[PDB]
Amino acid sequence: QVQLQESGGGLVQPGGSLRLSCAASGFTFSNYKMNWVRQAPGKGLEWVSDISQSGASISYTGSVKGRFTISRDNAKNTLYLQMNSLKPEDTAVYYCARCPAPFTRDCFDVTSTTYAYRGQGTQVT
Amino acid sequence: TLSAEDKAAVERSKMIEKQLQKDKQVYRATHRLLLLGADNSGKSTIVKQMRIRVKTSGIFETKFQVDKVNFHMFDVGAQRDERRKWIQCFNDVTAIIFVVDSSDYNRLQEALNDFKSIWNNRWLRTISVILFLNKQDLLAEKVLAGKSKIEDYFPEFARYTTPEDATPEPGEDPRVTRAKYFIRDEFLRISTASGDGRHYCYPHFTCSVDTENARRIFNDVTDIIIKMNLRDCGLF
Amino acid sequence: XXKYFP
Amino acid sequence: QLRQEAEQLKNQIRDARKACADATLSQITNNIDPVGRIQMRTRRTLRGHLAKIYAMHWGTDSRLLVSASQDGKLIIWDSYTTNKVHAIPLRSSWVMTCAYAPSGNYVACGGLDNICSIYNLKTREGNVRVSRELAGHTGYLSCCRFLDDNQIVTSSGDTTCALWDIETGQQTTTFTGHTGDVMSLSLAPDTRLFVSGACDASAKLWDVREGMCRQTFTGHESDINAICFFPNGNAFATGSDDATCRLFDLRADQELMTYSHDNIICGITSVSFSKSGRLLLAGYDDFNCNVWDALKADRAGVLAGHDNRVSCLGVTDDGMAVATGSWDSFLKIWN
Amino acid sequence: SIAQARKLVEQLKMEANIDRIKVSKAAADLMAYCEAHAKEDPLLTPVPASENPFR
Amino acid sequence: SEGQGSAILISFIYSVVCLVGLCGNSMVIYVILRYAKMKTATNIYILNLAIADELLMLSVPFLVTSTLLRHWPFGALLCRLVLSVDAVNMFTSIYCLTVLSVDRYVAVVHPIKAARYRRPTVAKVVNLGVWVLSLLVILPIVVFSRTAANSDGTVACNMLMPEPAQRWLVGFVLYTFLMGFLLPVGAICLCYVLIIAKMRMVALKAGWQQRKRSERKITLMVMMYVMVFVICWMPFYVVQLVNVFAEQDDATVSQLSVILGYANSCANPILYGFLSDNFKRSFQR
């Protein structure tokens, strides 16, 4: 069964660093594109980071380029996200989603309301 | 040879084939476009093409005529956020007009991500996309005000320079021209990362109140048609 | 003449 | 709040399914003789559609078949004489499903319009007209089939299923609980149960009289595209975008057999069993249909005669022919 | 939501009471069903052109 | 022994050009037929062009043997048949090139009507029509093509001229030159320049990126389709006119014109098949 568990959240101070870890099980972790999105209280979903299967295609949004970083481990099927220089506005719920179709470049429903292939996310303050 | 029932069946089949052949003419003569956009993307104003009844209707059709050529624009109505299954049905469409409003930068980058799913799609990789930068007056007023900064959402705007091919309208501030050209470049950096021979993009600058958008739509349709003809004949 | 010399 | 209870229930269900796994399907029946290379040839070539064909459905006589393409026209093809019997012009060109009544009197078709309109074939007006319209759904209809001579099953785009009554034209039975968009639904031969697959890598069994889900099997990893019920009335095969087909038994309540290959990476678009159920046909995105064995999980046959993506596949009630329709507006009958 | 979670928990508790049997019995039943109708399958046993209507 | 060496070199060049053309046309026919790509109108004209060029490359060995043996003991009827085939395959190739150019013109300039008259059926009818036209054009070159007695005592397979020698020869040469050059090259140049004008007008009316570094390739394609053809065919007719009207005796220089003319028909497959985006997928698969 497809199940993604995220961890690493805590009562962090503005300006610190957090190492979030997402572990997926029930499918081929090395054959699906991965995405990390955020949701702020009273706002909508926002695409943050995108990483391909091999890892050569990594993309970020405006306020993440040069600040955060993402890494992928296929031997252990893990996705790490290192966030440095945290701003007071970074308090949000982060979610990790996978690509619906394998061996595809497009990623639909990355910001969909109801997504069955997405974890519960973690709170970052 | 053939009995009475067989002869009647053959005659009915010939009549149906003649009807299909007659309908094929008006099917190939009229073009079909797909209008897409977000909620606040101004899709309610662009769809108003009446100048030439179901509450739960998830698809609407608008028929109009430009330069004697008939066009049918299909707009998705009440539909959930899951758009990965039905989008494969719009594979034989002539063009996809995606409305973009540059009024809220926080909702722009995310949208750009819809353009990169419209572009990096495996099945929709051969359909051109018509880009309309709607509501430029709002962006101009926001830039002249000075409250919202573009560099807060896009760092590349802090080092972007106006290209030599820029042609602004006489009387417009150079800042809004630089902003719209930066937006066009940001769209082109995504629209040029794939394809290069299968489909292209058509960026334009609209304000939701124009009487010449039909001419641009007809010109884009003609360009797509001649490109498809050049690709089919191998000349391309 | 034709495809020859003369 | 109660997530720990749901996790404990899921763990208990998983342990119960694992404890009952005595042997696998490929281990009980392994000494059987191989089916061999099943070579099929084209018998009839049906052409005439103006747009990409999307769905098809065989009747209960193996003589007529209904087809729904993306042009708003339905054609009742005849496999014996290779002729057209009826031409129904639709009010909408974007359809995604079609069906044929067992008595051959009504034909249903729906799509992006959220309405699976039913048309009558034996009308006295001389031309096919609108017989009934079913509105009320808040999403595109992916599977619209006939359950009986008076009921009609539909799978709406809001992750719900609805059994409508043809006489009154109102919502008679509802089925809610799905998290993903339902893509296909297969009815049982006894018209008592039906399995439905959604865009959540899971299939659910529902009853036509109880109105509740009793057996849910995840099995897959991506969105399920097609589904088909086994002729025995106790099993069903499912296919997703992960290029892996999976068989699930209702009585065993566990996955039976998995069909996959390293060369195939494209998902399944249509799936259907044969008359006996030993050969399982599945068309892929590489314009070909693979026929596997339901007992050996080996490549039994490959049929490649299409130029574009295959959209629909249908096996007759007697299994004498298999119709395949792709986006090239070409229906091909293989035997 | 709380109501959706409660409904899901109730559905799981109701579905976790099915009288599940072993897989060997279902496998044997499927094998017997496939062997019984093996001769009546035109795809498994290709009939000659003397009786095949698709000619 | 300079003449013998020059003849051997000319025959070797002829054989090399013949082998290159034969292998190219065989590869083209294999790509067209094996992959079952004979479904569009653009894939039938190219196939007929390849068939005509293959017939030309099969008729070339007759000219090679005529150059080597210089006797032709095969016979008068076989000589007439070989000349008729050698002429009709070239004329059919040129007419198929013209038909493909006209079809591309109607497609990219009159798109509406096009599809009405452009199905994969009308293509076979047009091919049969241009074959009949080629046969009718070659028919006057059939009666004259006979074996004449030379001074040394060997037969020569040439076009026999009636009692008017200076009149009818110049008339036939001029008619062949005029038709074969002006009609096809004109129908290929006017149509393609109208295509280019229409494309430029559409790009100007719908200006989003006027540069179009690909249309550069289209333009280059047209220009090639018409520069190699001219450079290969016009000097041949010029040499023929000089040898007929002026009758200037020189060294063995007229053979180079025929060599260039077949190299043109050997390279036509590249220009039309190898460069098409419609064949890269078939080559990779």
Q: Which residues contact F170 (CB under 8 A, 6 or more apart)?
A: F244, F245
Residue type at position F27? M
Report the chain B residue with the minimal C-alpha distance to residue A50: B113
Between vectors from CA D178 to CA D325 and to CA A107, what angle results, nearest 5°? 65
Half-sphere exposure (Cβ direction) of B169: Cα atoms closer than 13 Å: 6
Gap between the Cα atoms of A33 and A79, Å rounded = 11
Gap between the Cα atoms of D109 and D69, Å rounded = 10
**Among candidates F234, F201, F195, F214, which has minimal Cα distance to F101?**
F195
Interface test with D, best of B30, B86, B92, B127 (most D CBs within 10 A): B86
Task: Using the CB atoms, write b or e for D82-102: b if 16+ within 10 Å.
Answer: ebbbbbbebeebbbbbbbbbe
Residue A21 belongs to what H/E stretch? strand A17-25
**Among candidates E49, E39, E44, which has minimal Cα distance to D315?**
E44
Which tokens in the block code for residue B122?
A: 């495996």
Between vectors from CA D174 to CA D173 and to CA D175, what angle results, nearest 5°? 130
Which tokens in the block code for residue D86?
A: 């009826």
Gap between the Cα atoms of A118 and B2, Å rounded = 63
How many other C-beta atoms can be found within 10 angstroms of the C-beta atom of residue B5?
8
Interchain proximity B28–F103, CB inside 8 Å: no
How many other C-beta atoms can be found within 10 angstroms of the C-beta atom of residue F280?
11
Residue type at position B88? Q
- Residue D170, burial from CB neighbour count under 10 angstroms (0-12, 13-18, 19+): exposed
Q: Are D196 and D184 in contact (CB under 8 A)?
A: yes
Sign of the CA dihedral running D298, D304, D309, D311: negative
Bridge-based pairing state of the strands B129-134 and B201-205:
parallel
Gap between the Cα atoms of D247 and A66, Å rounded = 48
How was it solved? cryo-EM
D200 vs chain A: nearest CA distance in angstroms?
Answer: 5
Gap between the Cα atoms of B166 and B189, Å rounded = 17
Sign of the CA dihedral running A60, A62, A65, A68: negative
DSSP for D70-132 reads TTSEEEEEETTT--EEEEEE-S-S-EEEE---TTSSEEEEEETTS--EEEESS-TTSS--EEE
CA distance readout (Å), B131 to B76, B140, B194, D209:
17, 19, 16, 51
Bridge-based pairing state of the strands D95-98 and D106-111:
antiparallel
Bridge-based pairing state of the strands B95-101 and B31-36:
parallel
Interchain proximity F206–B216, CB inside 8 Å: yes
Which 264-323 residues of chain D touch chain A by CB within 8 A? 265-267
CA distance readout (Å), D272 to D227, D252, D314, E34, F166:
7, 21, 6, 15, 80
Domain count across chain D: 1
Gap between the Cα atoms of F190 and F105, Å rounded = 9
Gap between the Cα atoms of E23 and E15, Å rounded = 19
**Among candidates D119, D99, F210, F199, which has minimal Cα distance to B223?**
F199
Gap between the Cα atoms of D47 and D49, Å rounded = 6
Task: Using the CB atoms, write b or e for F127-159: b if 16+ within 10 Å.
Answer: beebbeebeebbeebbebbbbeeeeeeebbbbb
Gap between the Cα atoms of B129 and B184, Å rounded = 14
Q: Are D276 and E38 in contact (CB under 8 A)?
A: yes
Dihedral, CA of residue F75, residue F81, residue F85 and residue F88, to nearest 10? 130
Q: Are F180 and F241 in contact (CB under 8 A)?
A: no
Q: Which residues contact F244 (CB under 8 A, 6 or more apart)?
A: C1, F169, F170, F173
Gap between the Cα atoms of E1 and D177, Å rounded = 14
CA distance readout (Å), F119 to B154, D71, F123, F139, F277:
52, 21, 7, 31, 21
Which CATH number characterizes residue D65's domain?
2.130.10.10
Sign of the CA dihedral running F214, F218, F224, F230: negative
The gap between the terminal CA atoms of chain B, to the nearest Å, is 51
CA distance readout (Å), B63 to B47, B86, B221:
10, 22, 15
Residue type at position D110? G
**Among candidates F123, F63, F69, F70, which has minimal Cα distance to F89?**
F63
Resolution in A: 3.3
Gap between the Cα atoms of A48 and B36, Å rounded = 23
List the subunits that have 3+ CB pairs under 8 angstroms with A. B, D
Residue type at position B63? K
When the candidates are 4.10.260.10, 3.40.50.12280, 3.30.750.80, 3.10.180.10, the CATH number that belongs to E1-55 is 4.10.260.10
E-chain residues near D6 (CB < 8 A)? 5, 8-9, 12
Angle of the F76-109 helix axis to the B213-232 helix axis, nearest 10: 160
- Closest by Cβ to A104, choosing from B109, B122, B153: B122
Order of all β-strands in the sheet with D95-98: D95-98, D106-111, D117-120, D130-132
CB contacts < 8 A, A to B, total: 49
Gap between the Cα atoms of B41 and B104, Å rounded = 10
The DSSP code for D231 is T
Q: For tokens 């995604």, name the residue.
A: D96
Q: Are D293 and D26 in contact (CB under 8 A)?
A: no
The residues of F whose Cβ lies within 8 A of any Cβ of B are 40, 42, 103-104, 107-108, 111-112, 114-116, 198-199, 202-203, 205-206, 208-209, 214, 217-218, 221, 272, 276-279
SS (H, E, C) B148-183: CCCCCCCHHHHCCCCCCCCCCCCCCCHHHHHHHHHH
Q: Are C3 and F258 in contact (CB under 8 A)?
A: yes
Residue type at position B69? V
Gap between the Cα atoms of F238 and F257, Å rounded = 10
Bridge-based pairing state of the strands B69-76 and B31-36:
parallel
Gap between the Cα atoms of D273 and D271, Å rounded = 7
Interchain proximity D80–E53, CB inside 8 Å: yes
Dihedral, CA of residue B182, residue B187, residue B192 and residue B193, to nearest 10? 110
Q: Are D276 and E34 in contact (CB under 8 A)?
A: yes
Between vectors from CA A107 to CA A102 and to CA A112, what angle results, nearest 5°? 120
Residue F157 belongs to what H/E stretch? strand F155-159
Q: Are D65 and D77 in contact (CB under 8 A)?
A: yes
Half-sphere exposure (Cβ direction) of D80: Cα atoms closer than 13 Å: 9
Residue D290 belongs to what H/E stretch? strand D288-293
E41 vs chain D: nearest CA distance in angstroms?
Answer: 6
Q: For tokens 């559409």, name the residue.
A: F202
Gap between the Cα atoms of D257 and D244, Å rounded = 10
| Alpha carbon F102 to chain centroid, angstroms | 16
DSSP for F28-77 reads HHHHHHHTT-TTSTHHHHHHHHHHHHHHHHHHHHHHHHHHHHSS-TT-HH
Gap between the Cα atoms of B16 and F70, Å rounded = 66
A1 vs chain D: nearest CA distance in angstroms?
Answer: 6
Which tokens in the block code for residue B91?
A: 């594979």
Breaks (C-N over 2.5 A) in chain D follow: none
How many other C-beta atoms can be found within 10 angstroms of the C-beta atom of residue F50?
26
- Residue D209, burial from CB neighbour count under 10 angstroms (0-12, 13-18, 19+): exposed
Gap between the Cα atoms of E2 and F23, Å rounded = 75
Interchain proximity D200–A116, CB inside 8 Å: yes
DSSP for chain B reads ---HHHHHHHHHHHHHHHHHHHHHHHHHHSEEEEEE--SSS-HHHHT--TT---TT--EEEEEEEETTEEEEEEEE-S--S--SSGGGGTTS-SEEEEEEETT-GGGHHHHHHHHHHHSS-SSSTTS-EEEEEE-HHHHHHHHHH-SS-STTT-GGGGT----TT--PPTT--HHHHHHHHHHHHHHHHHHTSS-SSS--EEEEE--S--SSHHHHHHHHHHHHHHHHHHHHTS--
Which tokens in the block code for residue F71?
A: 């006797």
Gap between the Cα atoms of D329 and D308, Å rounded = 9
**Among candidates D258, D223, D192, which has minimal Cα distance to D26?**
D258
Gap between the Cα atoms of B138 and B105, Å rounded = 12
Between vectors from CA F126 to CA F123 and to CA F131, what angle results, nearest 5°? 125
C2 vs chain F: nearest CA distance in angstroms?
Answer: 7
Gap between the Cα atoms of D111 and D142, Å rounded = 7
Which tokens in the block code for residue D317?
A: 């009630």
Gap between the Cα atoms of B94 and B75, Å rounded = 14
Which domain range does residue D72 map to? 1-334
Sign of the CA dihedral running F199, F200, F206, F207: positive
CA distance readout (Å), F67 to B96, C4, F7, F251:
64, 8, 8, 15
Q: Are B222 and B130 in contact (CB under 8 A)?
A: no
SS3 A51: strand
Gap between the Cα atoms of D334 and D39, Å rounded = 10
Q: What are phi and psi of F145, to 5 degrees?
A: -70, 100
F-chain residues near B229 (CB < 8 A)? 107-108, 111, 114
Gap between the Cα atoms of D259 and D106, Å rounded = 36
Instruction: Detail the DSSP E strand segments found in D208-253.
Output: 213-217, 224-229, 235-240, 245-249
E-chain residues near D36 (CB < 8 A)? none
Gap between the Cα atoms of F52 and F29, Å rounded = 11
Gap between the Cα atoms of F58 and F53, Å rounded = 9
Sign of the CA dihedral running D26, D29, D34, D35: negative
Q: For tokens 């036939």, name the residue.
A: F172
**Among candidates F185, F136, F58, which has minimal Cα distance to F128?**
F136
What is the largest distance, in Å, between two alpha-carbon atoms of chain C? 9
Gap between the Cα atoms of B236 and B46, Å rounded = 33
Task: Using the CB atoms, write b or e for F170-191: b if 16+ within 10 Å.
Answer: eebbeebbeebbeebbebbbeb
Between vectors from CA D328 to CA D323 and to CA D330, what angle results, nearest 5°? 35
SS3 A2: coil
Which tokens in the block code for residue A60?
A: 């970020």
Q: What are phi and psi of A111, to 5 degrees?
A: -120, 30
SS (H, E, C) F162-187: CCCHHHHHHHHHHHHHHHHHHHHHHH
How many other C-beta atoms can be found within 10 angstroms of the C-beta atom of residue A48?
22
| Alpha carbon B28 to chain centroid, angstroms | 19
Gap between the Cα atoms of D106 and D164, Å rounded = 14
Half-sphere exposure (Cβ direction) of F244: Cα atoms closer than 13 Å: 21
- Residue A25: beta bridge partners? A3
Q: For tokens 């990126």, name the residue.
A: F209
Q: For tokens 């009288």, name the residue.
A: E19
Gap between the Cα atoms of F258 and F240, Å rounded = 11
Half-sphere exposure (Cβ direction) of D217: Cα atoms closer than 13 Å: 26
Bridge-based pairing state of the strands D279-284 and D288-293:
antiparallel
| Alpha carbon F30 to chain centroid, angstroms | 20
Gap between the Cα atoms of F102 and F118, Å rounded = 11
C-chain residues near F66 (CB < 8 A)? 4
Q: Are D235 and D256 in contact (CB under 8 A)?
A: yes
Residues in chain B: 236
Q: For tokens 């609209």, name the residue.
A: B206
**Among candidates A22, A25, A14, which has minimal Cα distance to A85?**
A14
The DSSP code for A63 is T
